[PDB]
Amino acid sequence: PENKEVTPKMINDDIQLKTAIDSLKTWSIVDEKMD
Amino acid sequence: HMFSRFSNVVSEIEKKYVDKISISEIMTKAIEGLLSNLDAHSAYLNEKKFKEFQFGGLGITVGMRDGVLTVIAPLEGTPAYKAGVKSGDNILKINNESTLSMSIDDAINLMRGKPKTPIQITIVRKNEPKPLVFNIIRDIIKLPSVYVKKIKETPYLYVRVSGFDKNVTKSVLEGLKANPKAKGIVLDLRGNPGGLLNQAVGLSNLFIKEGVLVSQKGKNKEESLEYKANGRAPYTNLPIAVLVNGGSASASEIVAGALQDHKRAVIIGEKTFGKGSVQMLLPVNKDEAIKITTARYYLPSGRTIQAKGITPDIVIYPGKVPENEKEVTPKMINDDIQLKTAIDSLKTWSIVDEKMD
Amino acid sequence: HMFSRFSNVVSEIEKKYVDKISISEIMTKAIEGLLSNLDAHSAYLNEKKFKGITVGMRDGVLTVIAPLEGTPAYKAGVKSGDNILKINNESTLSMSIDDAINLMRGKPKTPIQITIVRKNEPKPLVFNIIVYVKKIKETPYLYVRVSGFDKNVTKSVLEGLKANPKAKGIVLDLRGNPGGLLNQAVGLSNLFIKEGVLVSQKGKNKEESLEYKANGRAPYTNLPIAVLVNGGSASASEIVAGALQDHKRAVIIGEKTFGKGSVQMLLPVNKDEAIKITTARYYLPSGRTIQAKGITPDIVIYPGKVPENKEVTPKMINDDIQLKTAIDSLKTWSIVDEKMD
């Protein structure tokens, strides 16, 4: 939805990649809270 | 005795002006002009206005952005939402009078008044090349704000807070108690204009055990209040997933901001409408008083809400996710992608919990 | 004393505000607030004008933020908003903010060549920086387009009309004219009016009520006139339209005008500070004022296109319908003149 390395260009092209990055952001937050 | 600079200017204005205005009228224009020049949210109450200050309305919460009047968020139960008023628009006129320069207090006075009284508002929208005129009738409709709805085929609830009014903490606590088998929350704060601070720290107190919740600090050492969590937090481990949107402010970012800094939740949505400040009505004269901001609340970290806002950890925008009765059906989740993403962040939280179990 | 109301408020602000503000800072906030609340046009002047053009990005195109009055380049003849092609032999397709200010702005009194392409000009015009009359084709009516009420405008209009002794009507165009010097505006209206009152400045005092009366040196009393006005005309442009309309010396055609009948008398108040307020307002021959009801044209017509089936071409007339109406009102004037003759 709209308003050598992985730039945000193709991240927006496919939604499955974006969901995987958001799933990793949630993993980091839970790790920090439990730490 | 630094009034010399003001005395020189006022000495020539009263002498060479087209009209006949007394010193009293000129000074009132100076007091009112100075207050409106400090910041947006200041106003002056005269002899007549102050006495009458101490029900109903269209439900529009208003605030100024970059010098232009804008609507923060219309409440769901009020006719403003039903009429078609949306957040982010610019108010141009009300009752056929211009909105070039006023304050929040008088603008609220225009909306508020006797119920069942029609009001005409002209609104300029980004997507509309021409301003549109809206006719809205007033009412005194009372609707519950906080309600919990279990989501089907998931252990995750859905707690929507429409407004931070009184007894929100009790309703949230009872709603979470009514589902002892729950294993998640979707704390929806989208389009929440604001509410009371004393209850915002109460709601977040259910989740945070140790650590400051928010701190108000002016330019003076005293009056610098600081709210801290108590040891009676019952739900220090249950997963949360807060939803925010550009129509949330004024203790809609105290609940979201405090959880974000304490890593108690995953803020999801768009950037919030940055609005953090405390306004009081200090009396200055016999029956004249000024409304001047003195202190803001800084998030547990120490950063400020005005006017940066809350940047969600996951940024998304409203839309339909691509596809190929007292509960949250799978259908209603599909219309808005922001609600589906909030459940997705809850699934990852559960998986990490099981892995670390 | 009289400062009791302000002293109490200014102390509370200095004591219980979010930030720490000195009395000097709060005084300027109060001064600038008072002038703004007095009138929209009035404004407090810090360092006045004695003590040059900024280009920003808006909708993907370059726009001018604020032009300075003291820059001599403004009087040179450089017009903003044009499709700029070259600035000192530099490509304008891709420039930065720092590049623009360092290139387009330089030391004055030095030759600088810019290439600008104008929509109406078939070829680009090269400008080096160190109010016209045009006969309308196939019609005996001239076209006195006054873009701005600058100096010598009255002399230029009178001289240009003397170059066309066969004149039979004037489309006096005052559309989109912010205004200018009153003394020149009265001089322009004095060409066409033999006797009467032109304008009158008035304030709150019986003295200083200036009144302007026409003299007998009007050369073009009987020449037909059809003034064009719109919402972009202010001050001196409304002075001519109102003075002619009240004297029945012209036919005003167009839309309603924005009243700007006031005088902003700049005046110092301190060592390096000044104020600007309204001191006199302009009242048209009848008596009614220009601010802010403006001038109601006799023949009201909004911009549009006419329906299909060195000089002013017939094709150029068709683009704007107001110009066609002004020529039509001159044709009727000629017929009525002939009938009584």
XYZ file of C-alpha atoms in Angstrom:
733
model
C 0.000 0.000 0.000
C 1.009 3.579 -0.741
C 0.600 6.796 1.228
C 24.519 -5.461 -4.014
C 22.146 -4.439 -1.217
C 18.412 -4.425 -0.524
C 17.250 -0.847 -1.015
C 13.618 -0.008 -0.137
C 12.895 -0.069 -3.888
C 12.050 -3.745 -4.376
C 10.875 -4.082 -0.763
C 7.820 -2.049 -1.772
C 7.401 -4.006 -5.021
C 6.521 -7.293 -3.286
C 4.532 -7.421 -0.054
C 5.864 -10.810 1.099
C 9.356 -9.397 1.643
C 7.930 -6.473 3.620
C 5.973 -8.795 5.919
C 9.160 -10.748 6.640
C 11.019 -7.594 7.694
C 8.135 -6.573 9.967
C 8.185 -10.072 11.468
C 11.877 -9.576 12.250
C 11.228 -6.184 13.858
C 8.737 -7.808 16.234
C 11.295 -10.510 17.053
C 13.885 -7.890 18.023
C 11.453 -6.034 20.299
C 10.464 -9.181 22.212
C 14.148 -10.052 22.606
C 14.894 -6.622 24.089
C 11.909 -6.735 26.454
C 12.881 -10.173 27.784
C 16.536 -9.108 28.107
C 10.824 49.526 33.119
C 11.348 48.062 29.642
C 7.910 49.276 28.487
C 9.650 52.175 26.709
C 9.726 50.322 23.382
C 6.014 49.508 23.643
C 5.220 53.046 24.820
C 6.856 54.640 21.770
C 4.913 52.488 19.296
C 1.595 52.917 21.109
C 2.195 56.680 21.337
C 2.097 57.090 17.542
C -0.610 54.507 16.786
C -3.201 56.285 18.942
C -2.258 59.652 17.398
C -2.247 58.954 13.634
C -4.846 56.243 13.005
C -7.811 56.496 10.644
C -10.353 55.608 13.343
C -10.944 56.818 16.905
C -9.811 54.046 19.267
C -9.128 54.600 22.956
C -6.066 53.328 24.807
C -8.169 50.531 26.311
C -9.062 49.149 22.877
C -5.456 49.361 21.663
C -4.067 47.606 24.742
C -6.623 44.800 24.442
C -5.444 44.267 20.865
C -1.855 44.130 22.140
C -2.616 41.583 24.876
C -4.631 39.406 22.496
C -2.042 39.776 19.734
C 0.895 38.867 21.970
C -0.824 35.723 23.260
C -1.617 34.594 19.712
C 2.024 35.343 18.812
C 3.676 33.172 21.483
C 2.217 29.967 20.022
C -0.949 28.592 18.462
C -2.675 27.216 21.574
C -2.876 30.482 23.548
C -5.954 32.672 23.889
C -7.190 35.656 25.890
C -10.511 35.688 27.758
C -12.047 39.134 28.247
C -14.522 40.318 30.887
C -17.554 38.761 29.189
C -15.884 35.610 27.843
C -14.254 34.598 31.137
C -17.458 34.778 33.188
C -19.455 32.558 30.816
C -16.741 29.891 30.483
C -17.348 28.242 33.866
C -23.995 20.694 26.519
C -23.055 19.180 23.176
C -21.041 19.597 20.022
C -20.242 18.190 16.612
C -17.439 16.138 18.178
C -14.681 17.668 16.045
C -11.343 18.004 17.829
C -9.408 20.878 16.281
C -5.760 21.907 16.242
C -3.489 24.162 14.226
C -0.736 22.762 11.998
C 1.793 25.004 10.197
C -0.427 28.010 10.845
C -3.555 26.475 9.272
C -6.585 25.179 11.161
C -6.911 21.398 10.815
C -9.107 18.645 12.250
C -7.291 16.062 14.365
C -9.969 13.349 14.514
C -13.777 13.215 14.730
C -15.143 10.823 17.325
C -17.063 7.823 16.016
C -20.299 8.497 17.902
C -20.550 12.185 17.015
C -22.228 13.401 13.799
C -18.916 14.734 12.442
C -17.793 11.219 11.503
C -21.175 10.467 9.916
C -21.198 13.693 7.883
C -17.891 12.894 6.190
C -15.321 14.917 8.113
C -11.911 13.255 7.850
C -8.559 13.853 9.503
C -5.825 15.898 7.860
C -8.134 18.409 6.162
C -7.972 22.191 6.531
C -10.905 24.151 7.953
C -11.597 27.267 5.873
C -14.899 28.659 7.181
C -17.588 28.082 9.798
C -20.927 29.925 9.868
C -19.834 31.778 6.698
C -17.094 33.566 8.667
C -13.423 33.218 7.788
C -10.933 31.165 9.815
C -7.841 33.273 9.125
C -6.617 33.598 12.728
C -8.326 32.432 15.918
C -7.544 29.989 18.741
C -8.859 26.617 19.889
C -10.969 28.072 22.707
C -13.190 30.275 20.538
C -13.349 27.685 17.747
C -14.597 25.138 20.288
C -17.140 27.742 21.410
C -18.459 27.961 17.844
C -18.989 24.191 17.664
C -20.304 23.812 21.213
C -23.712 25.101 22.232
C -27.321 24.005 22.335
C -27.982 20.527 20.897
C -29.910 20.126 17.640
C -28.515 23.388 16.254
C -27.299 23.192 12.632
C -23.779 24.357 11.799
C -22.238 24.923 8.358
C -18.518 24.239 7.869
C -16.395 24.820 4.763
C -13.518 22.336 4.484
C -10.576 22.354 2.062
C -9.272 18.871 1.244
C -6.085 17.811 -0.521
C -7.962 15.472 -2.877
C -10.695 18.066 -3.541
C -9.802 20.973 -5.871
C -12.791 22.904 -4.472
C -13.805 23.384 -0.824
C -16.984 21.547 0.153
C -19.740 22.844 2.441
C -21.056 20.466 5.109
C -24.260 20.830 7.130
C -24.137 18.990 10.464
C -26.803 18.835 13.173
C -25.755 18.650 16.816
C -26.692 15.962 19.329
C -25.948 14.701 22.834
C -25.415 11.072 21.820
C -23.460 9.109 24.432
C -21.602 6.023 23.220
C -19.216 3.645 25.017
C -15.578 4.305 24.153
C -13.545 1.231 25.143
C -14.885 -2.185 24.136
C -13.090 -5.525 23.802
C -13.934 -7.948 20.990
C -12.395 -11.395 20.669
C -11.004 -12.241 17.231
C -12.208 -15.470 15.644
C -9.917 -18.531 15.344
C -7.221 -16.628 17.272
C -6.429 -16.214 20.983
C -5.877 -12.466 20.457
C -8.410 -9.890 21.636
C -9.075 -6.477 20.081
C -9.270 -3.500 22.452
C -10.493 -0.333 20.728
C -10.206 2.930 22.671
C -12.302 5.570 20.908
C -11.550 8.265 23.493
C -9.547 8.557 26.712
C -12.478 9.544 28.912
C -13.015 8.532 32.539
C -13.129 4.915 33.749
C -11.224 3.696 30.679
C -8.756 1.891 32.951
C -11.567 0.027 34.721
C -13.226 -0.936 31.430
C -9.930 -2.209 29.998
C -9.182 -4.192 33.163
C -12.668 -5.728 33.204
C -12.566 -6.493 29.481
C -9.245 -8.295 29.847
C -10.638 -10.106 32.899
C -13.657 -11.322 30.907
C -11.281 -13.356 28.686
C -8.842 -15.181 30.990
C -7.749 -17.347 28.035
C -6.579 -14.369 25.957
C -2.993 -14.337 24.691
C -2.744 -10.972 22.959
C -4.077 -7.449 22.564
C -4.604 -5.218 19.553
C -4.669 -1.813 21.261
C -6.405 0.259 18.595
C -5.784 3.982 19.129
C -6.498 5.088 15.554
C -8.362 8.376 15.280
C -8.304 8.995 19.030
C -8.325 12.775 19.637
C -7.077 12.478 23.212
C -8.256 12.497 26.791
C -7.172 12.851 30.398
C -3.591 12.290 31.508
C -4.579 10.914 34.923
C -6.285 7.983 33.191
C -3.708 7.491 30.418
C -1.046 6.605 32.984
C -3.647 4.402 34.672
C -4.261 2.329 31.543
C -0.552 1.884 30.824
C -0.023 1.025 34.505
C -1.586 -2.393 33.842
C 1.369 -3.362 31.627
C 4.483 -1.624 33.022
C 5.865 -2.669 36.409
C 9.058 -0.621 36.858
C 10.046 2.592 35.111
C 8.818 6.143 34.589
C 5.679 6.474 32.471
C 5.832 10.167 31.526
C 7.337 13.361 32.937
C 6.010 16.914 32.706
C 8.776 19.526 32.847
C 8.436 23.267 32.317
C 11.164 25.870 32.540
C 11.021 25.913 36.362
C 12.421 23.275 38.701
C 9.148 23.051 40.625
C 5.858 21.840 39.106
C 7.996 19.328 37.162
C 5.802 16.312 37.827
C 6.896 12.757 37.054
C 4.604 9.724 36.840
C 6.069 6.328 37.732
C 4.772 2.776 37.514
C 3.773 0.930 40.676
C 4.542 -2.658 41.598
C 0.950 -3.878 41.137
C 1.108 -4.330 37.358
C -0.860 -7.544 36.693
C -0.160 -8.116 32.994
C 3.576 -7.458 32.692
C 4.061 -10.338 30.217
C 0.983 -10.462 27.968
C 1.735 -9.479 24.347
C 0.490 -6.166 22.958
C 0.300 -4.641 19.481
C -0.673 -0.963 19.482
C -2.164 0.724 16.410
C -1.706 4.461 15.834
C -2.683 6.833 13.043
C -2.353 10.522 12.192
C -5.563 11.183 14.109
C -4.098 10.307 17.514
C -2.627 12.753 20.030
C -2.768 14.089 23.588
C -2.464 10.895 25.687
C -2.997 8.774 22.602
C 0.806 9.064 22.448
C 1.327 8.698 26.198
C -0.038 5.152 26.057
C 1.692 4.428 22.747
C 4.875 6.317 23.609
C 5.389 4.795 27.052
C 4.923 1.249 25.756
C 7.315 1.882 22.860
C 10.094 3.173 25.123
C 9.602 0.311 27.596
C 9.497 -2.249 24.746
C 6.091 -3.430 25.963
C 4.438 -3.267 22.529
C 5.027 -2.890 18.796
C 3.559 0.392 17.556
C 2.027 -0.145 14.111
C 0.503 2.360 11.712
C 1.390 5.855 10.509
C 2.979 8.826 12.240
C 0.815 10.333 14.958
C -0.336 13.953 15.017
C 2.338 15.511 17.209
C 0.468 17.280 20.015
C 1.910 17.293 23.520
C 1.319 20.246 25.842
C -0.485 21.319 29.015
C -2.641 24.456 29.013
C -3.922 26.267 32.097
C -6.061 29.310 32.730
C -4.046 31.392 35.194
C -5.998 34.467 36.386
C -4.084 37.700 35.807
C -6.626 40.441 36.614
C -9.883 40.800 38.547
C -11.938 39.009 35.881
C -9.405 38.594 33.055
C -7.206 35.537 32.582
C -4.744 34.117 30.063
C -4.500 30.586 28.664
C -0.772 29.932 28.231
C 1.057 26.635 27.784
C 3.757 26.072 30.399
C 4.853 22.422 30.353
C 4.878 19.436 28.015
C 5.199 15.736 28.807
C 8.350 13.995 27.610
C 8.225 10.240 26.784
C 9.846 7.801 29.292
C 13.084 8.182 27.283
C 13.139 11.990 27.629
C 12.329 13.005 24.025
C 9.299 15.155 23.285
C 5.949 14.550 21.564
C 5.467 18.135 20.347
C 5.657 18.057 17.553
C 7.603 15.040 16.311
C 4.936 12.572 17.412
C 5.321 8.807 17.612
C 7.083 7.006 14.769
C 5.639 3.469 14.586
C 8.025 0.533 14.482
C 6.073 -0.821 11.491
C 4.848 1.756 8.966
C 1.816 0.953 6.801
C -1.083 2.831 5.244
C -4.814 2.090 4.951
C -5.832 -0.190 2.115
C -7.094 -3.601 1.085
C -4.731 -6.516 1.701
C -4.121 -8.388 -1.593
C -6.045 -11.654 -1.885
C -5.941 -14.612 -4.259
C -21.538 -10.295 15.877
C -19.581 -9.372 19.042
C -16.469 -10.784 17.347
C -13.916 -9.710 14.747
C -14.803 -11.693 11.636
C -12.120 -12.586 9.074
C -13.989 -10.363 6.608
C -13.637 -7.103 8.553
C -9.908 -7.753 9.016
C -9.401 -7.876 5.240
C -10.712 -4.368 4.487
C -7.982 -2.622 6.514
C -4.426 -3.924 6.216
C -3.373 -2.165 9.432
C -5.513 -4.520 11.519
C -4.166 -7.628 9.779
C -0.576 -6.484 10.332
C -1.259 -5.986 14.042
C -2.265 -9.645 14.338
C 0.839 -10.607 12.354
C 3.024 -8.879 14.944
C 1.141 -10.805 17.633
C 1.828 -14.153 15.945
C 5.577 -13.479 15.894
C 5.436 -12.530 19.577
C 3.775 -15.855 20.413
C 6.315 -17.845 18.379
C 9.248 -16.204 20.177
C 7.521 -16.872 23.502
C 7.162 -20.580 22.698
C 10.759 -20.820 21.464
C 12.031 -19.177 24.665
C 9.634 -21.215 26.836
C -0.956 53.961 35.228
C -2.501 53.151 31.846
C -0.040 50.260 31.362
C -1.571 48.355 34.297
C -3.461 45.850 32.135
C -0.433 45.035 29.977
C 2.094 44.957 32.831
C 0.194 42.243 34.709
C -0.123 40.008 31.638
C 3.462 40.465 30.436
C 4.762 39.408 33.862
C 2.736 36.180 33.884
C 3.963 35.215 30.411
C 7.586 35.850 31.400
C 7.166 33.716 34.545
C 4.993 30.717 33.566
C 5.695 30.006 29.893
C 7.193 26.882 28.333
C 10.434 28.618 27.342
C 12.461 31.388 28.951
C 11.839 34.575 26.956
C 13.501 37.891 27.732
C 11.474 41.086 28.016
C 13.107 42.289 24.793
C 11.866 39.167 22.998
C 8.352 39.431 24.445
C 8.147 43.128 23.531
C 8.693 42.402 19.834
C 6.040 39.674 19.978
C 3.585 42.154 21.500
C 4.469 44.939 19.050
C 4.111 42.724 15.981
C 0.887 41.289 17.389
C -0.681 44.706 17.947
C -0.077 45.936 14.391
C -1.399 42.699 12.882
C -4.555 42.941 15.000
C -5.036 46.604 14.049
C -5.299 45.896 10.313
C -4.248 43.210 7.855
C -2.159 45.649 5.803
C -0.393 47.267 8.767
C 2.867 45.610 9.785
C 5.708 46.349 12.184
C 9.083 46.932 10.527
C 12.279 45.582 12.072
C 15.301 47.322 10.519
C 12.623 48.871 8.222
C 13.698 48.747 4.563
C 17.025 50.611 4.517
C 18.681 48.021 6.769
C 17.836 39.303 -3.538
C 15.270 36.823 -4.854
C 14.750 33.397 -3.280
C 13.759 30.403 -5.418
C 12.008 27.414 -3.859
C 10.381 24.167 -4.940
C 6.583 23.995 -5.203
C 4.744 21.266 -7.142
C 7.999 20.375 -8.899
C 8.511 23.871 -10.343
C 10.553 26.867 -9.220
C 8.623 29.642 -7.463
C 9.756 32.962 -6.011
C 9.457 33.128 -2.223
C 9.922 36.835 -1.489
C 11.293 39.645 -3.691
C 13.231 42.393 -1.914
C 12.191 45.983 -2.588
C 15.693 47.441 -2.253
C 17.259 45.272 -4.958
C 18.045 47.333 -8.094
C 17.507 44.188 -10.187
C 13.767 44.481 -9.510
C 13.653 47.790 -11.403
C 15.935 46.409 -14.136
C 13.045 44.610 -15.830
C 13.438 40.997 -14.729
C 10.040 39.306 -14.415
C 9.460 36.324 -12.138
C 7.510 33.208 -13.064
C 8.834 32.992 -16.625
C 10.111 29.713 -18.069
C 13.799 30.325 -17.426
C 16.053 28.643 -19.998
C 19.628 29.780 -19.265
C 21.207 31.774 -16.432
C 24.790 32.805 -17.276
C 25.044 29.874 -19.716
C 23.993 27.353 -17.050
C 21.397 24.623 -17.523
C 18.258 25.275 -15.471
C 16.891 21.721 -15.728
C 18.794 20.603 -12.601
C 19.928 23.211 -10.066
C 20.220 23.282 -6.284
C 19.255 25.981 -3.800
C 22.890 26.956 -3.200
C 23.665 26.878 -6.930
C 20.682 29.098 -7.759
C 21.512 31.866 -5.277
C 25.212 31.873 -6.196
C 24.449 32.038 -9.939
C 21.390 34.249 -10.480
C 22.534 36.701 -7.772
C 25.826 38.563 -8.078
C 27.476 41.914 -7.548
C 25.260 44.668 -9.022
C 26.357 47.039 -11.793
C 27.917 44.088 -13.650
C 26.609 42.811 -17.012
C 24.819 39.462 -16.761
C 23.134 37.769 -19.727
C 20.095 35.520 -19.250
C 18.166 33.602 -21.915
C 14.406 33.482 -21.314
C 11.747 31.922 -23.548
C 8.379 33.689 -23.437
C 5.122 32.039 -24.476
C 3.934 34.945 -26.640
C 7.382 35.614 -28.153
C 8.228 33.277 -31.072
C 11.943 33.539 -30.222
C 13.767 33.704 -26.871
C 14.773 37.177 -25.711
C 18.238 37.809 -24.268
C 18.164 40.252 -21.346
C 21.318 42.007 -20.131
C 21.277 43.469 -16.612
C 24.027 45.962 -15.796
C 2.079 50.908 -20.213
C 1.852 50.605 -23.995
C -0.600 51.479 -26.770
C -1.351 48.952 -29.517
C -3.763 49.529 -32.385
C -6.374 46.793 -32.750
C -6.417 45.272 -36.226
C -9.339 46.212 -38.512
C -10.868 48.445 -35.811
C -10.274 52.156 -35.098
C -10.029 51.439 -31.346
C -6.653 51.452 -29.599
C -5.595 49.256 -26.666
C -3.989 51.153 -23.774
C -2.785 48.273 -21.600
C -1.397 49.561 -18.293
C 0.556 46.756 -16.628
C 1.715 48.851 -13.674
C 1.107 52.368 -12.340
C 4.773 53.337 -12.236
C 6.292 56.754 -12.891
C 5.869 58.537 -16.249
C 2.867 56.301 -17.054
C 0.638 59.336 -17.617
C 3.220 60.906 -19.936
C 3.668 57.632 -21.835
C -0.095 57.225 -22.284
C -0.579 60.820 -23.440
C 2.368 60.674 -25.849
C 1.314 57.308 -27.272
C -2.232 58.512 -27.907
C -0.811 61.579 -29.668
C 0.811 59.151 -32.127
C -2.684 57.965 -33.173
C -4.737 61.056 -34.086
C -7.307 58.733 -35.704
C -8.256 57.238 -32.328
C -11.918 56.310 -31.918
C -11.962 54.382 -28.625
C -9.688 53.084 -25.858
C -9.759 49.660 -24.201
C -8.123 50.902 -21.006
C -6.950 47.590 -19.541
C -6.382 47.678 -15.774
C -6.701 43.925 -15.206
C -4.237 42.526 -12.684
C -2.799 45.929 -11.779
C -1.675 46.113 -8.121
C -1.529 49.907 -8.320
C 1.028 52.665 -7.887
C 1.484 56.358 -7.237
C -1.750 58.274 -6.687
C -0.307 61.506 -8.101
C 0.229 59.730 -11.424
C -3.170 57.998 -11.283
C -4.937 61.343 -10.858
C -2.796 62.646 -13.713
C -4.062 59.819 -15.922
C -7.714 60.424 -15.025
C -7.180 64.163 -15.554
C -6.660 63.437 -19.263
C -10.299 62.417 -19.715
C -12.184 64.471 -17.087
C -12.728 68.189 -17.650
C -14.085 69.121 -14.211
C -15.201 67.581 -10.935
C -13.684 65.666 -8.035
C -11.312 62.748 -8.603
C -10.599 61.338 -5.113
C -10.308 62.484 -1.500
C -8.057 61.180 1.274
C -9.628 61.335 4.731
C -8.718 60.233 8.251
C -9.927 61.017 11.754
C -8.923 64.703 11.514
C -10.670 67.583 9.764
C -7.245 68.810 8.654
C -5.219 66.642 6.213
C -8.411 65.734 4.298
C -6.789 65.985 0.879
C -9.101 66.623 -2.072
C -8.176 66.357 -5.753
C -9.987 68.352 -8.442
C -9.573 68.103 -12.202
C -8.229 71.043 -14.195
C -9.135 72.318 -17.644
C -6.176 70.705 -19.429
C -8.054 67.524 -20.390
C -7.358 66.878 -24.102
C -9.470 63.753 -24.581
C -12.798 64.633 -22.964
C -15.023 63.150 -25.689
C -12.947 60.090 -26.618
C -14.798 56.811 -25.903
C -13.347 54.657 -23.123
C -14.044 51.089 -21.958
C -12.079 50.209 -18.811
C -11.453 46.536 -18.021
C -11.159 45.501 -14.366
C -11.027 42.238 -12.434
C -10.135 41.000 -8.956
C -6.431 41.653 -9.539
C -6.764 45.452 -9.592
C -6.027 47.433 -6.439
C -5.440 50.985 -5.178
C -4.534 53.349 -8.031
C -6.150 51.089 -10.634
C -9.434 51.313 -8.718
C -8.880 55.077 -8.468
C -9.206 55.463 -12.238
C -12.123 53.037 -12.579
C -14.137 54.666 -9.803
C -13.384 58.226 -10.902
C -14.484 57.514 -14.474
C -17.541 55.499 -13.416
C -18.788 58.218 -11.057
C -18.258 60.831 -13.795
C -19.908 58.582 -16.430
C -16.755 59.041 -18.528
C -16.233 55.312 -19.145
C -17.853 51.879 -19.089
C -16.293 49.502 -16.564
C -16.361 45.906 -17.820
C -15.230 42.820 -15.933
C -15.529 41.503 -12.377
C -15.506 42.987 -8.885
C -12.260 44.544 -7.669
C -10.413 44.071 -4.379
C -10.575 47.285 -2.362
C -7.171 48.778 -1.550
C -8.156 52.339 -0.678
C -5.605 52.993 2.059
C -2.206 54.627 2.539
C 0.580 52.841 4.430
C 2.693 55.704 5.794
C 6.049 54.278 6.839
C 7.528 56.176 9.771
C 10.456 55.555 12.145
C 9.775 55.171 15.855
C 13.192 54.261 17.342
C 16.893 54.168 16.482
C 16.548 51.348 13.935
C 12.827 50.493 13.998
C 9.728 51.754 12.209
C 5.988 51.120 11.972
C 3.552 51.052 9.059
C -0.148 51.796 9.564
C -3.092 53.091 7.566
C -3.503 56.859 7.913
C -5.701 57.901 4.970
C -8.307 56.028 2.924
C -9.477 56.893 -0.651
C -13.108 58.029 -1.274
C -14.283 58.082 -4.961
C -15.958 61.161 -6.522
C -19.428 60.263 -5.180
C -18.201 59.722 -1.624
C -18.357 55.936 -1.234
C -15.021 54.231 -0.383
C -13.016 51.649 -2.335
C -12.325 49.482 0.767
C -13.473 46.946 0.641
C -16.541 46.636 -1.583
C -14.472 47.578 -4.631
C -15.991 48.593 -7.957
C -19.031 46.866 -9.443
C -18.607 46.908 -13.245
C -21.571 47.998 -15.335
C -21.195 44.925 -17.574
C -20.241 41.939 -15.414
C -18.554 39.130 -17.353
C -16.265 36.395 -16.006
C -13.230 35.028 -17.883
C -13.904 32.495 -20.600
C -13.745 31.658 -24.289
C -15.989 33.109 -26.992
C -18.368 30.560 -28.568
C -17.338 29.053 -31.881
C -19.265 29.139 -35.154
C 2.896 45.770 -32.632
C -0.861 45.305 -33.036
C -3.725 43.250 -31.625
C -4.639 40.342 -33.887
C -8.271 39.204 -34.229
C -7.197 35.725 -33.108
C -5.781 37.147 -29.869
C -9.155 38.720 -29.032
C -10.901 35.328 -29.086
C -8.801 33.887 -26.238
C -10.319 36.183 -23.587
C -14.007 37.067 -23.713
C -13.614 40.223 -21.601
C -11.545 41.912 -24.310
C -14.228 41.093 -26.885
C -16.912 42.596 -24.641
C -14.840 45.761 -24.217
C -14.613 46.166 -27.997
C -18.361 45.529 -28.248
C -19.036 48.298 -25.722
C -16.900 50.617 -27.854
C -18.869 49.748 -30.998
C -22.106 50.714 -29.241
C -20.494 53.973 -28.103
C -19.604 54.845 -31.699
C -23.159 54.185 -32.911
C -24.778 56.349 -30.222
C -22.288 59.127 -30.987
C -23.160 58.974 -34.691
C -26.915 58.969 -34.045
C -26.808 62.197 -32.015
C -24.338 63.761 -34.474
